[PDB]
Structures are given as C-alpha cells and as structure tokens.
Assembly symmetry: D2
C-alpha cells in the first residue's frame, strides 16, 4: 500500500462572508502550499472544521482538493464519524472522489464506552470495508481520549491499516507504539510540529502539522534535518517552532491559525460559528509568539 511518510499540512476550510465554503480561496491557498515538499495534504482533518460541514460539503471539499493537487501528492482525507456505518460510507465516498487514504478520528461522544475492544471493532470494520488504506487518528485535545496502545498494536496487524497520526504529544507513548508495531507495516506521524523532532528520534516518519499551513518550509526543513542526522541544527529549529506551534494549536486553535494565515498572505478568513474571532489580547499574544521566535 502507499507510503505515508513525510509532512502534511491539515488544510483549513476557507469560508465566505456568508459562511459558505470559499472554493476559490481554497484552490488559491492549495496552489501556494503546493510549493513546499509536503508528502501531500490532510483534508477535512480537525483543522479543516469538518464537524461544521455538511456531509456533502465534506465530500466536495475532498473532490475539489483532489483536482487542485498533483497526482503524485497524497490526499489523506478525514472520513471519521461517530458511528461505524457512517464512517464506512464517508470513507467509501471519499475514496470515490480520489482520496488516497482515510484518516479516521476515534469516535468519542460516548467516551466512557469507547473501550479498546470497541475501537478495535470500529477500525477493523472500516478497514475491512474501505477501498483505500486507513490511518488511525488519536487527538485527545478534541476527543478527550487516547486510542489505547493495545488497540493500536492489534490494529497495526490489519493489512489495510497502514499507520497513525498521534496528536497527544507523549513521546514515551509514541516510542512505545513504534516499538510494539515494529513487525508490522505501520507508519507513525506526529500530529503537531511542537514534538516533531522528538517523534522522529523515537521512530515516527513524519508529521501532520497545522503549523505547516504558515511555516511550511521550516517544518519541511525540520524533517530534512532529522532525516539526515543533523540533530543539533534540528534542535535549534525545533526550539523556535514550539511557541508558534502552541499558538495555532493549544492556545488559539483554528482562529489563531487562520489569523496567522491572513498575516502571512494566505486566505485565513473566518471560522464557522460557534468558533469566534480572537480578542485583541489574543491577537497580540499570537503575534508575540511568532515575532519573539523570529518568524514575523
């Protein structure tokens, strides 16, 4: 199956002044981001505001991104839904419009009953029925749960489950996942630029990083430094990405990411309600996280 190693920005969904998906701005942004040596794009991931899109919007976004992308760049499409059957259908439909692989977030509304066995069954079914490879996706900042290690190890054995994006930032956990799945075809990607160097050191083979929407060359440079054994230079660059990374993830989220996109000359624009614009104090804090690290 495919090779998912490398760097991807999880791309945003631009909206118009009336909250419609702005496909013109989407295409413009993607053409700009195309200049960086990314493996591809993560589309309708958390940073894409997928919970705020209709079924049909979610599908058409994947379809349009496929058209604005080179054939040899990998389209990793967010197809995860709460129900297993809905996830199957979304995964099939996204494959049909050209997704190379399906990145499937853990169901999480019923967190108390999302046991290892439940999650194993969910992902096994999706992987069984998906015409494209499946990538597991654990993101406790949004879901309140880690996909358990025992479940990851079991799932890594499935022929159609090719890797995972872990956004939790626990490199002891990530190291253990790499180690325990070493006999399988199973590639681990970091879910943020803040712990990317450490992830590479522990055996992860790339990153899906919101920060790459604005510092794409720097995140790719970090990958290069890690892959060529330049760990001292990698350290220095990694250090300077920590605060800007926190700014567009844990601190200010997608509103922070879109604001910084605006300031860098991309179309950031509005989020969909209930997400709101940053307060002036938040804007200033966001600015400082970039300026004090030499990026703005």
């Amino acid at each position: 199956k495919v090779d998912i190693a490398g760097i991807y920005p999880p791309v945003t969904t631009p909206f118009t002044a009336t909250a419609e998906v702005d496909y013109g701005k989407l295409e413009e942004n993607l053409h700009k981001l195309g200049t960086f040596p990314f493996r591809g794009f993560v589309v309708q991931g958390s940073n894409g505001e997928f919970p705020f899109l209709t079924s049909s919007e979610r599908l058409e976004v994947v379809s349009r991104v496929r058209q604005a992308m080179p054939k040899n760049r990998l389209l990793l499409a967010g197809s995860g839904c709460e129900s297993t059957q809905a996830t199957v259908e979304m995964t099939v439909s996204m494959a049909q419009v050209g997704a190379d692989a399906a990145m499937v977030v853990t169901p999480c509304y019923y967190r108390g009953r999302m046991s290892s066995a439940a999650l194993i069954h969910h992902y096994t079914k999706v992987a069984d029925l998906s015409p494209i490879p499946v990538v597991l996706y654990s993101v406790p900042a949004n879901t309140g749960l880690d996909l358990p290690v025992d479940a990851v190890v079991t799932l890594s054995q499935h022929p159609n489950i090719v890797g995972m994006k872990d956004s939790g930032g626990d490199v002891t956990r990530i190291g253990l996942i790499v180690h325990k799945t070493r006999k399988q075809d199973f590639q681990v990607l970091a879910g943020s630029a803040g712990f990317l160097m450490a992830s590479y050191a522990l055996g992860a083979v790339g990153g899906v990083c919101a920060l790459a929407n604005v510092l794409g060359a720097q995140v790719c440079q970090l990958e290069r430094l890690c892959c060529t054994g330049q760990w001292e230079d990698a350290q220095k660059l990694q250090h300077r990405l920590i605060e800007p990374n926190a700014a567009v993830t844990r601190r200010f989220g997608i509103p922070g990411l879109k604001k910084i996109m605006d300031w860098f000359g991309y179309y950031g624009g509005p989020c969909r309600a209930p997400l709101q614009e940053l307060s002036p104090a938040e804007e200033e804090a966001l600015r400082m996280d970039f300026t004090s690290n030499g990026w703005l």
Copy 2:
C-alpha cells in the same frame, strides 16, 4: 412559554438486527412509558444515540415520537449540532414535526475554543432563530466541558431560553445557577436520577433521567416526595437509586441501559456500532447494582 418542570426519560433508539431504527419497538416502548406521570419525553438526547443517526433518521424519530405521544405531554427534542447554523436548521426542522422545545447540547469538538462568549453567541443565535423554546444542555461526561455559569446566567435572560438540563452532578454549581437566574424565567432540570433529590433541594424543578426508562414509577415517586416535603422518605428512595443509576450512566452507559430494559420487559436491544454489548462480567455487575438495591 411552556413549563418544563417534571420528570422525563431520555428515550432510547431501538435498532433492528440489521441496525435500522425499529419504529415498531420504539412505539411499543413509548406506549409502555406513557403510563408514568412524566412531563414528557426527551427524544434524541444522549441516551437516544443521536450522534449515530443520520439527519433524516433524527428528524423522523422526533416525528414518530410526536405521533405516539399525547398532545399534552412535552416533546423535548435534541437538536444540538457542532455548528451553529446546523443547530438552527435541525431545531427548525424538529419544531416543524412537532417538538415542543429544543434541548441543545454544547458544541464540544473544539473544546479549547468553546469559551463562555462562544457558547453565549451559539445559544443566542439558536434561541433567536428557533420557533420553539430552547433548553440548554450541559453533559461533561460526553462533552468534556461544563457550560460555564457566567454563560448560563447571561443566556437565562433570553426570552426564548427557558431552562437547562445539567448532567454534571455538582449541586454546588446547580444551586448557584438556580440562585443567579432567580430573576429570570429559567427552570433547571437534573440530568440524572443519582442527584435528583439534592437538585430539588437546591431549587431544580425536575429531571431528565436515563434511569426513568426502567424505574419510571420510582423516579416519579422521588419527585413526589421532594415536592411534598417528604424528605426523610425521599432520602431512603434516593439512596436506593444511586447504584442502579450509576450502572446505566457512568458505569455501563447505553449498553447497560438497554440490557436492563431487556430484563424489565421493554425492548432494549442493540446499540449502533461502535457501541458494543456488555461483557459477561459487566452484565453481572449491572445485575448486582439492581438486585442489591431491591429492584430486580
């Protein structure tokens, strides 16, 4: 606007052996539950597996429940979605098929950015555009977040926001909400039978209780004892509902609730994947929580 005081079971969604909504079993269960002096039914709440239904299923369930209900029983319909615009549309559509009021869960996927201001704006918009009264719904066991008190107080002032269901079980918080909204038309309902007596003592005026799907007469009796000042008898009954309540909520959730429904002669049946059947050990623990408190 309506008076929402009283007891409601948040009704389940029965499914067939092929995971389709079983409307026959739904109607049969509702006719049975109709015998208890509930204020009404909460439909497509958390216990209804609403995240696992399609838009259309969610709507048709509300429509069918309205048909199987007396006109003077209150249909409180779960219309909450992640996006504000989707919530508006679902709320309008549910009103159109006969919902008396809309119970609107807090958006929660982007928990880090669900500030008081964001949630205020979300609920204000929905309440502005809803043709039926809005009931706030805070359930941190599923969402990972409490609707903040300051937001509740602000929202209580809206003419079209008539109350709240709090499932968090913090009676200091609930007491404070009652106290701070005392000048408004704003009725608080407990979200579980485990803290119902204490909620009444603090000024809540009812409960939406999963446990009422199986111990409806007992939950209604508890209401009666609290409303008539029989606090000593209320205490004894409340004590005996704690473990059975924990069993069908925090311990074993909807799978536990549906299993106990089966054992009591209702149609419990299967959950939709990814929810799974109880393990034999879990079944036994569930059984013990009911038997040791004299209910089975």
Copy 3:
C-alpha cells in the same frame, strides 16, 4: 464513642510578623468563635496550615486550643501524616494533650499506590493504635485523591472509626457512603459550607466548614434549618453562602479566609510561606463575593 454530629470551624493558625505561631491571637479568635453553637473545633486541619508547622508546633497548638475550649466542646485534631507509623505517633501525642478525636487525612504523595487496600491498612492500623476515635478525611482539592467508597465502607466497620469528613462536594458519592454504612456507627460530615444543605438532605449529620470562621452564626442557622425540616428557608440561606464559600476555599483558599477574617474583626493575619497575600484584584473579587451576597 463520641457523637461527632454538628458544625465545626477548622480553625486557622495565626502567625506573627516573624512567622511564629501567635498563641495570643489564637486564643482571642477561639474565645470569639466560642460564642456560636458549634459542636467543637477542628484543629490542625487543612485550614490550620498543618503542613507548615513543625511536629512540636502542631502538638502545642492542639494543647493550647484544648485549654481555651470548654470541656464539653469536641476537639477534633488533625493528626494525619504521610507514613502510617508517624500518623500513629502524632495521633497518640494529640490524644495525650486532650484531643477528643483524630481527623486523619489520606496519605497522598504516592497517589498512584494509595489503593483501597493500602488506605484500608493505613486507617485500620491508626484506629487499632489510637486511644481516641478516628475520623476519616478525604479532601481531593489538596490531595488529588478521593478515599474510595469501598475503603470507606470497610473502615466504617471498625469500632474505633466513627465517621468521616468529605470535602469533595459530590453528593451522589456522599449519599452512597451514608447508604452503604447505614448499619454501622459512622457519621458523615460535609467538608465545606457550599454543599452543606444537600449533605444533610442525603444523610450527613454536620459540617467542618472553613466558612464558619467568619459566618459561624449563618452556618449554624443553616444546620438548624436543615435539622428542623425548614428546607425552603435552608435553600435561600444555602444559596447565599455558595459564592462566599467558594471565595475562601476553591478560589482564594486560606489567604482569602484570613483576609475575610481581618475584615470581620478577627485576627486573620499572614499565612506561612509559600502561601502569599492576595493580589489587589483577588482582594476585590473576594470582597465582591461577600458584598453581593449581603454579608459585607
């Protein structure tokens, strides 16, 4: 053994300008607090800054309080240490200087290994070797842990373990503890004034309340209203104590409590380092919590 029902303030330790224990101010405060119909005093509890005192100070504080107290008021002395053997020795020494009962906080530094069995063994040993009755004390805001219900139930069977102070504010948990220990001589006290009415409703028989250091008559009035079935008046008073209670506990802690003591004419004075004075903003917020509820 004794009857521990009723209200107690957990008294502070006054310090001089040079951080020495101010026994003169201690005696003056206690004589003032003696006017309220408390069951007694909780001495060297969390609000007494016991972790900041030497062994000898902790003992001499209990000794001096005993001298400044009526013989028929109950001295409940905080004797809990991390180690079981140290707890035994402190409990014996405090008994020797006149403590009526020992209130024993859960060891908590090694929280990951403080299992039910470990805590059962700890309290069983202390109760075995203590010449005075033992009161369990669970306070997760300071310890990060709840004494587990199964451990409480087992321990309630010990002839020398006569009750518990629970500060966690979970009235479902407290209701369950009352219910499961109903066959034992085991009295439950709430650990704060914020959930006192609900605690009484669920079968607790009193409260150890930091707030009683400044609103002693009001907390005692609340007890009276609960014990005489005046639940409607109890509700109104309970509502008005919630914010002032939060102010001197979860919001501003002992520095908040001592500041309000100053403002009410008691000696509040300084805490021992590392505790610090309130910032001006914190002072103002503290003031507002009291003034907006009609107490200042």
Copy 4:
C-alpha cells in the same frame, strides 16, 4: 557552581523487618551502584520515600550516603518541604552533612494557591539562603502540579539555581524550558528513563532515573549513545527501556522498583506503610515488562 549533567539513580531507603532504616543494606546497595558511570546519587528524592522518614532520618541518610560515596561523585539531596522556612533549614542541614546540591520539590498540598509567584518566592528564598546550589524539581505524578514554565525561566536567572529535574515527560515543555533558559547557567535533567533520549535530543543534559537502580549500565549506555550522536542505536535501546521504566514508575512505583531490585540481587526489601507489597498479579505484570524486553 557544580556541573550537574549526567545520570543519577534516585536511591531507595532500605528498611528492616521492623521498618527501621537499614543502613547496612543502604551501604551495600550504594557500593554496588558505584560501579556505574553515574554523575552521582540523588538521595531522599521521591524514590527514597522521604515523606515517610523523620527529619533526623532524612538527614542521617544523606550523611551516611556521603560517607559511602567517592568525593568526586555528586550528592544531590532532596531537601524540599511544604513550608519555605522548613525547606531552608533542611537544605542548610543537608549541606552541613555533605550534600553537593539541593533538589527541591515543589510544595503542593495547597496546590490551588501554588501560583507562579508563590513558587518563584519559595525557590528564590531557598536559593538565597542555601550554602549549596539549588536544583528545581517538578514531579506532577506525585504533586499534581507542574512548576510553571514562566516560574522556571525567572528562577533560572538566580546565581544559586543551577538546573531542574522534570519528571512530567512532556518533551514540548522540556524543549521550551531549555530554549527559554538558554542564556542562563541552567541544566535540565529528565526525571525518568522513559523519555531520556527525547530529552537529550531537546537539550536536556542528563537524567535522574529510578530505573538506573536496576539497569544502571543500560541507562548510562543510553546517555553515551545520545552524547555521541548514535541516535539509531539510542532509539533501539530507548524502546526497550520504556515498559520496564513504566513498571517501576507509573505502574507499580517504589514497591515495583524494590521488587525488581530484589530479583536483580540488590536489597529492595519492604517499603514503609502505607506503601504495600505488590499483589501476585502485579508481580507477574512487573516480571513480564522486564522479560518481554530482554532484561530478565
């Protein structure tokens, strides 16, 4: 001031069958551990059961360890107490019996009031008054709190605060601390062997690792591989230390560590109550974590 870079085991306190400190077994263990190229010993750290020792035992343990140690090995002594004044006195007394530096755990009982300012003031005072260099110590598994980054950065400026041991395992946080204190004389040590390689990659210069009590050569080898740029071999070794490290820290704690010490031929022996022996199931799980990684 000293150079604290390198590996240290935080040594245990052996106890006799009657719970007395077994200084004979302590000396025997230390002589054995002396064979590894550690920088020194961490004495009366968390793994030493310091909360369970008397003042005098804590002091005499440091004194005896100093006697059983080479003059050129660094004695890093745990002198942290809840109160600032007690910490000062313990730090001075430990210096007097030969400690090279004082490792000072964050006060944590009053966690809600342990603000950055409070912790800054606490450590500034201790560092002002200590005749030996101070090492900050953050260990949220035991304290429930992280020493905040802003406080660490401020404190790193003090001439007598020479570094920190962080046990929290968050390499984004550790990377940020290294980066923000880069202009100061301030050395960061990892607090466990599970994230040691990643810590080195991010700019930490050593580790205080419970695991080094039993796999001292392996932890030192890991240091060597990181310091010589052998990251591929470092990865493989780091992977194999993760589960054994979890076993003697987060899973089974000091009882697990002492049991494995027994099995490796050291004196592990009993913990002080309330710590208990492992259950047979826990013993078996501990065994498996070592055997499945090739260490036993």
